[PDB]
């Protein structure tokens, strides 16, 4: 569950 946040996280700034 929490894992998903970590894998997504590096892309967030582009959005």
H helices present in 1-15, as ranges: 2-8
State the Cα–Cα distance between residues 12 and 5, nearest whole angstrom.
10
Resolution stated for this PDB structure, in Å: 0.8
CA distance 13 to 1: 21
Cα–Cα distance for residue pair 15/1, rounded to 1 Å: 21
Using alpha carbons only, how large is the chain's radius of gyration in Å? 8
Query: Percent helix, strand and coil across the chain, each rounded to 5?
Result: 85, 0, 15
Experimental method: X-ray
CA 6/CA 9 separation, integer angstroms:
5
């Amino acid at each position: 569950v929490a894992a998903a946040v970590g894998l997504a996280a590096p892309q967030x700034p582009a959005f």
